[PDB]
Design a protein around this ligand. Structure first.
Ligand SMILES: *[C@H](C[C@@H](O)[C@H](O)CO)C(=O)O
Ligand SMILES: *[C@H](C[C@@H](O)[C@H](O)CO)C(=O)O
Ligand SMILES: *[C@H](C[C@@H](O)[C@H](O)CO)C(=O)O
Ligand SMILES: *[C@H](C[C@@H](O)[C@H](O)CO)C(=O)O
Lengths: 293, 293, 293, 293
């Protein structure tokens, strides 16, 4: 199995993509053994990016690596098709899309048509990004089978049964969990990996959890997974999408600029409190020789 | 109380806004007694429109009427602030925003800051558009009170206790329901009216339900409410946002062109089936003299 | 419309039904204008009562009045059938049942069969007690129409559209809301009234809201409704089912003993904090001549 | 890890526990390698049993084996305390209770007091039976740690993150999943096993999935797991609790009498339809040499 980073998008103070900070971060993740980078995902604030910015993201990360899954979805299908066709000049892993978000009670037929249209024009393997809480709908294993053109799925859902069902109904699909908390479990249970937000700031940890679980050192894998869980839980206290910037700076030592409001940056007080929640974790990890310091 | 229409955005064959069809629609709604027009709401596919398109909708409806509430929200706060500021040269009723959508678990603090930021730049009264199912969050009467700058609220939720609470905790706030099914009830219970999708295609019916209920003719109000409910129900069979186009053309006589995919237009068969579902209702309305042939 | 009290079951210090306190409570409620008494409901802890105790409650209240709806439901259909049959000797208004609770994913067919079975043996009219949150399932207007034998429904749900649908699909059904917060609304919108827990402790308030709404004094009805809402809200701080005992003693001046654990009695400090929350409301109601003192 | 059966309670034609059928079934389960029996759980219709019947289930099963976890919970705490104290004369593994069901919004404090009360009187290790969908309450890993006295937990929820958290926050607790679909995953990931309704009718399948998983034959384990998933899905067509009876008779060759209505028995046609849905699975299991014939 693989660890895939849904890469954070660094913004400048005037709310443009900071390409140079993105490249440093992408270069670091690849050097620390991350397999592939999922670009314009939730963690990257994809829904907050215009189609031009989605492409800008791809071009900057492509300067560093071709190991990219390029997320192109949105609520203007013409724009998503355009992005899908534009990726033809990039030798990347795949494109991806979440389901059309916001609008409740879209028909199965319309959802299947949305995705089949993207598969039709795609010059690369297409990945389903299934995220029911964020999008308001579920594209489960049976609807994925019906659409029939997915090379893989990232399933972000608190239900590993649902994730396993993609493998059960679609044995040749790549099946990833969108959860940082399930690296050990996914690797132990025959699933294909994790698209793990926390791999942005602790890539060392997520790679080691997966490696321990593969060696069948499950007790050791769980011990490290449970420490990683505590960092995930701390990030959620003030808002994980904002906190991910602060933790990256903290653990990896470079900054990633700002998020895009209404994803507001943490303020000084929040930042102090987040750091006190994780500094003792940061100490144990150095002690275990997972972090240099 | 008032009936406000969240006006449909008509799109051309090549996916631009049909300004001229929009004006025709807006004019008919106003001539048939609709009090105000909510522009760029859900029914108008506001989340599917770029900022520039949200501005085109306003300019187009503004040619017809100034009775406008202008929805400006999105996931790029700089753009929302820019729209809010641009509305200064339009003598309209107010601007509005739904909560930032897609991203789950945004803190109350961030949500409050988002809306306070809009109020601080707005040259017009601000309306809260609360739609928990679509946006993934709830800006309830308590949180609305804390934000403290709303002139009104549109509450799309089936729970009328929640809606009544806005008036309870904010005695001066204008409080509308986002339901077509609650016109008689809202008018009967001391609330300010309804922002009703179905008033796009049946403005006569929604205005008459309201009038009947105002005259304490609740049995007759409910009878007409219950017929309207059947049309709402029919529009959900193939998807309401798509179905609204077909119903407007059927009941009002002119077309509103296409929705924007992934809100796909009904096909010929679906259109025929939908009409069969509402045929008997159109006949009953004609015979009650609510509609003419 | 009516106010119907789901009457509290007072337990002794040794956890038996206090028959005498129950008779004192029921006499008072009838004296204060309550229309009918709903026995073994949620407020009366019906699910915590054996079938023998559900019969004792009926016997005790029946000393006081024949204006009773006798709730008989549970997870042993043979006991429910036996309670329904034994009600033949009581000249009461009707029997009732919630849907079989606890077990999730019960089929429509099995649910319909449960209610038809009680209707087949009942010597009295049968009321549906619909409470999806408590029981895990919803017996909606269409399912009720299918069952075909209900005289009325108590709908405890946060969605008045759902409650109105009963009236729409079953024009001759008596349709009650299970909320205290919807008394003014229900009476304003042509529904049949409320089965209101809060009428245990403020019967005078619930009757007055209803009367004001009936007289089309909706602003006065709402002012009083909103006051009552605050009491309901206070009652939820330490748990409504427990707090209802304390409020009844405080507002009505007699004791109703204890709830049955695990519905634990409030402790002294909770009771003191509760009263602190509603003491100013009591003063208002006294000043308004709604309560005597 | 272990497979524990939440054993079905067979009822006679006249709705009494059929002790001799229960003993035959219990004996067969143990003989087929099941580790322990969980008595009066959901699958055994514990909420449909009086305290006396719960105790009757214990005595009949105790005739066969002492490998019993005795479920005692209910909405009369005195009756639960009684069952707990009565279990003193049985040399069994532990007692268990689900949370108080039906009543929504019970306070954490009241939930904690309920379990601690049971723990203070228990003469055996106490197991938490956590089942949020059935009971309306979650007793998560943090609330379990707060109660402090649980030797183990059965977590019936699809979200394995939640189940792993028990282990993370209570390293000495036995942690079981209540899912049949997670047997291979649970065993693979360092958890203590599964309390699996489907082990009543296919104990051989569930034990073999676990054994294969333990051997790190994950692909083999998943292939069997996936067949077992199909039987679980088949059982849900007409209602799993009722279907479980028909499936046990079909696969194990003896019958289990009747469930207790409103858990209604499948009729002749439903049984034939259910058999046709699992027939081809049986043949696959025969070909895999899991079953004879
Ligand atoms: C993939 C992971 C997401 O699904 C997280 O659950 C969002 O917090 C991604 O970030 O693109
Ligand atoms: C106004 C009402 C909405 O909340 C409806 O649910 C969509 O039809 C709007 O269109 O924004
Ligand atoms: C009727 C009203 C209920 O549904 C409340 O939720 C419980 O206080 C009743 O008490 O039975
Ligand atoms: C244990 C397993 C349950 O929790 C199932 O979820 C019921 O569907 C049991 O049957 O006691």
């Amino acid at each position: 199995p693989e660890i895939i980073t849904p890469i954070i998008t660094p913004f400048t103070k005037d709310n443009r993509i900071d390409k140079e900070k993105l490249k440093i971060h992408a270069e670091n993740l690849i050097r620390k053994g991350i397999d592939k980078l999922f670009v314009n995902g939730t963690t990257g604030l994809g829904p907050s990016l215009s189609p031009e910015e989605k492409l800008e993201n791809l071009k900057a990360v492509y300067d560093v690596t071709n190991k990219i899954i390029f997320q192109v979805g949105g609520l203007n299908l013409d724009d998503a098709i355009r992005l899908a066709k534009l990726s033809k000049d990039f030798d990347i892993v795949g494109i991806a899309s979440y389901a059309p978000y916001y609008y409740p009670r879209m028909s199965e037929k319309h959802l299947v048509k949305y995705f089949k249209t993207l598969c039709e024009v795609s010059p690369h393997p297409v990945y389903l990004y299934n995220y029911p809480t964020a999008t308001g709908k579920d594209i489960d294993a049976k609807v994925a089978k019906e659409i029939g053109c997915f090379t893989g799925v990232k399933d972000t859902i608190e239900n590993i049964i649902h994730t396993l069902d993609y493998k059960r109904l679609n044995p040749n699909m790549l099946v990833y969990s969108g959860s940082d908390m399930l690296i050990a479990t996914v690797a132990s249970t025959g699933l294909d990996g994790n698209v793990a937000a926390g791999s942005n700031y602790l890539p060392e940890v997520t790679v080691t959890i997966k490696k321990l679980a593969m060696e069948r050192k499950i007790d050791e894998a769980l011990k490290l997974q449970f420490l990683h869980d505590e960092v995930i839980e701390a990030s959620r206290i003030f808002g994980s999408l904002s906190s991910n910037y602060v933790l990256t700076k903290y653990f990896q030592g470079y900054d990633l600029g700002y998020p895009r409001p209404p994803i507001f940056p943490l303020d000084d007080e929040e930042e102090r409190q987040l750091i006190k929640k994780v500094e003792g974790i940061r100490a144990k990890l150095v002690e275990l020789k997972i972090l240099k310091e």
